[PDB]
Design a protein around this motif. Sequence first.
Motif, short mmCIF file in Angstrom:
data_model
loop_
_atom_site.label_atom_id
_atom_site.label_comp_id
_atom_site.label_asym_id
_atom_site.label_seq_id
_atom_site.Cartn_x
_atom_site.Cartn_y
_atom_site.Cartn_z
N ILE A 86 -89.58 -19.14 125.66
CA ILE A 86 -88.34 -18.92 124.94
C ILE A 86 -88.42 -17.76 123.95
CG2 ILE A 86 -87.60 -21.32 125.16
CD1 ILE A 86 -88.57 -21.82 122.37
N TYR A 87 -87.29 -17.08 123.79
CA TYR A 87 -87.14 -16.02 122.80
C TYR A 87 -85.94 -16.42 121.94
CZ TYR A 87 -89.90 -13.75 126.45
OH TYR A 87 -90.85 -13.46 127.40
N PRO A 88 -86.16 -17.38 121.03
CA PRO A 88 -85.12 -18.21 120.40
C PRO A 88 -84.15 -17.49 119.48
CG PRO A 88 -87.31 -19.15 120.10
CD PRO A 88 -87.50 -17.75 120.55
N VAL A 89 -84.65 -16.60 118.64
CA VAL A 89 -83.85 -16.08 117.54
C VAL A 89 -83.59 -14.58 117.67
CG1 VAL A 89 -83.57 -16.24 115.05
CG2 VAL A 89 -85.08 -17.81 116.23
N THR A 90 -84.18 -13.98 118.70
CA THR A 90 -84.12 -12.55 118.90
C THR A 90 -82.70 -12.00 118.88
OG1 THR A 90 -85.97 -12.94 120.43
CG2 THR A 90 -85.11 -10.70 120.27
N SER A 91 -81.78 -12.70 119.54
CA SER A 91 -80.39 -12.25 119.63
C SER A 91 -79.75 -12.05 118.26
CB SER A 91 -79.56 -13.24 120.46
OG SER A 91 -79.43 -14.48 119.79
N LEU A 92 -80.05 -12.95 117.33
CA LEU A 92 -79.47 -12.88 115.99
C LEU A 92 -80.21 -11.86 115.12
CD1 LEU A 92 -77.95 -15.44 113.72
CD2 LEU A 92 -80.12 -14.49 112.93
N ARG A 93 -81.51 -11.72 115.35
CA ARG A 93 -82.32 -10.78 114.58
C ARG A 93 -81.85 -9.35 114.79
NH1 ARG A 93 -86.30 -14.04 112.39
NH2 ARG A 93 -87.66 -15.18 113.84
N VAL A 94 -81.60 -8.98 116.04
CA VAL A 94 -81.16 -7.64 116.38
C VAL A 94 -79.71 -7.40 115.97
CG1 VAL A 94 -82.81 -7.28 118.25
CG2 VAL A 94 -80.62 -8.36 118.73
N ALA A 95 -78.89 -8.45 116.05
CA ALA A 95 -77.48 -8.35 115.71
C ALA A 95 -77.32 -8.14 114.21
CB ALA A 95 -76.74 -9.60 116.15
N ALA A 96 -78.09 -8.89 113.43
CA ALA A 96 -78.02 -8.80 111.98
C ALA A 96 -78.49 -7.43 111.51
CB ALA A 96 -78.85 -9.90 111.35
N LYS A 97 -79.45 -6.87 112.22
CA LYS A 97 -79.93 -5.53 111.93
C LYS A 97 -78.83 -4.51 112.19
CE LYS A 97 -83.16 -2.88 110.47
NZ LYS A 97 -83.58 -2.98 109.04
N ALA A 98 -78.09 -4.73 113.27
CA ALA A 98 -77.04 -3.81 113.69
C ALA A 98 -75.85 -3.82 112.74
CB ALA A 98 -76.59 -4.12 115.11
N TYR A 99 -75.54 -4.98 112.18
CA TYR A 99 -74.48 -5.07 111.18
C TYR A 99 -74.86 -4.17 110.01
CZ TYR A 99 -73.42 -9.43 113.68
OH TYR A 99 -73.14 -10.37 114.64
N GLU A 100 -76.07 -4.39 109.52
CA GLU A 100 -76.62 -3.69 108.36
C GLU A 100 -76.52 -2.18 108.48
OE1 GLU A 100 -80.60 -4.98 107.52
OE2 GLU A 100 -80.98 -3.42 106.03
N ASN A 101 -76.92 -1.66 109.63
CA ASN A 101 -76.91 -0.22 109.87
C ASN A 101 -75.51 0.37 109.97
OD1 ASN A 101 -79.72 0.21 109.87
ND2 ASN A 101 -79.89 -0.43 112.01
N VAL A 102 -74.60 -0.35 110.60
CA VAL A 102 -73.27 0.19 110.81
C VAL A 102 -72.39 -0.01 109.58
CG1 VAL A 102 -72.17 -1.83 111.88
CG2 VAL A 102 -71.43 0.47 112.51
N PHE A 103 -72.64 -1.08 108.83
CA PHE A 103 -71.93 -1.33 107.59
C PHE A 103 -72.37 -0.35 106.52
CE2 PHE A 103 -71.38 -6.07 108.73
CZ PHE A 103 -70.29 -5.74 109.51
N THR A 104 -73.67 -0.12 106.46
CA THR A 104 -74.23 0.88 105.57
C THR A 104 -73.55 2.22 105.84
OG1 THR A 104 -76.39 -0.22 105.57
CG2 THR A 104 -76.33 2.06 104.84
N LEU A 105 -73.42 2.54 107.12
CA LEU A 105 -72.85 3.80 107.56
C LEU A 105 -71.40 3.95 107.13
CD1 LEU A 105 -73.48 6.38 109.14
CD2 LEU A 105 -72.78 5.17 111.21
N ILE A 106 -70.60 2.91 107.36
CA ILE A 106 -69.19 2.95 107.01
C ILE A 106 -68.99 3.03 105.50
CG2 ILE A 106 -66.95 1.79 107.17
CD1 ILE A 106 -67.81 0.47 109.69
N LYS A 107 -69.86 2.37 104.75
CA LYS A 107 -69.76 2.42 103.29
C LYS A 107 -70.22 3.77 102.76
CE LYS A 107 -68.45 0.87 99.43
NZ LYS A 107 -67.98 -0.54 99.43
#
Lengths: 290, 289
Positions: free
Chosen positions: A233-254
């Motif tokens: 199993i790769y249990p939490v990977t989906s959320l780990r990468v998604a949360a990283k992606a929010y951070e980068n794109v939100f940082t960018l928009i701000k």
Amino acid sequence: NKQSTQEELANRFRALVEANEILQIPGAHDAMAALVARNTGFLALYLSGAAYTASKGLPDLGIVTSTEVAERARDLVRATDLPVLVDIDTGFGGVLNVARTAVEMVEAKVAAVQIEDQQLPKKCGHLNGKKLVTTEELVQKIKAIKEVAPSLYIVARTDARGVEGLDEAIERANAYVKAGADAIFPEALQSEEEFRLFNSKVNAPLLANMTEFGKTPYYSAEEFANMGFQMVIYPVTSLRVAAKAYENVFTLIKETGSQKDALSNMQTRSELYETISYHDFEELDTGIAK
Amino acid sequence: QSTQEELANRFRALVEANEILQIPGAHDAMAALVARNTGFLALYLSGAAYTASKGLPDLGIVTSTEVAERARDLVRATDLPVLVDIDTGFGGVLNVARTAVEMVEAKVAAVQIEDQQLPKKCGHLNGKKLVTTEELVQKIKAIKEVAPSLYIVARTDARGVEGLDEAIERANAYVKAGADAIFPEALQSEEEFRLFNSKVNAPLLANMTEFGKTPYYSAEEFANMGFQMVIYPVTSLRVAAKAYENVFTLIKETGSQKDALSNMQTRSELYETISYHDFEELDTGIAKT
């Protein structure tokens, strides 16, 4: 639509396990992640309490209900028609609660459930507890599942290695198996030799937990396979990468005032169109129309 | 833990404020939390992003309760003003009323209602007709009478299907009906921005969604062009999806996720973001005999 039945899904899952080649089971915290996994070619999905709770903005501390978990699991099956293994912690209560959890998962067409011998909830003050329930305590819970939901594939998790010892875990494991568990999740075995030894002494397929930044090195699935594992199993990977992606794109928009520079890091409307199968609804509405 | 009226009165102050208000879409709580940590002052719940997150198309087949429960998650995680796309209100006037109360209960600050017609006919699925002007007016009236404390954004798709003039006419009527601000979909150029702005008696919202009919203007440019707020509706999901794709392909074809370690939120940042400490302090703080 051509969905499968739960009993078809559990058996398909079992097949996947008994298969010669190792089964990779990605965590999907939501239906979109579930759809991407399927399209990426995975044949089973995982719903982890960790990723689920984190999605809802909650800590993994057993404060979600069986009803909530069973609904998100619904989302997964409804979207993909894939066998889904659901982390049900300790069954959200006693033998009777475990019994109801089992029904709700079968209703959601869940293929398999993962139940653990951790003792929950933790005593006040020592919420960072590591104690486990008695072997019998899980044994009865497993029997409860086999009783009410015989169509449910059972994976049993034990945290006994790091708190009681290797042979202790092996003993617990074999008990859970005779109680009705179809597979074992041995948390944090500590070496190649422990993996092979555990496999040698336990009469069940074994699950490997490939969660990042944990007590397990980054072995490949092929590596786990010859080392005595039949699913991973790769249990939490989906959320780990998604949360990283929010951070980068939100940082960018701000910072820049625009999402200009992150366009390449995006799923297109075209990819989205086909991912949620927009076309197949259209052919539905027009087929009815004429 | 703010009241609904508090969250609504702040969102409205944010609108009237001199600095243009950036409103990112957060399809779930985690997205919402990161937007907060990033420094945004308001959140958007997009119909397209929500449904797609549940693996559904934006065809109006989600219920108001569904949206209400997700909006609940967002407000709970961040205590930020949230603007919720409620489509056409999921039914008639009385459905709109129901939808409003639910949102007020959910502590939603603002809602967005549109003049597209729903449901759509057979064969005319891709159809683009709007409802009569009074139909939306009656619905805005409903929200005003049933949920007075709820900020109202009215979206017109009139520029695209009817004309620039009817867009202005519809908007103004929506305004006088109770709309606090208007969302003019797909105005064609800056010239049309200013004219509409000059002709419309209300604050304006800009839709900065990707791969659409709208250029990638900065927030400050929108401000200079007449806008007092701008949304980024689907973005969270757009980046979430592609990240799944890349890591899943990696796992499927490498056998391992080693090469994506830098593209991930750490356990520590996760710990931080969900305020795991607060629960420890609560739990241990009670342990005092």
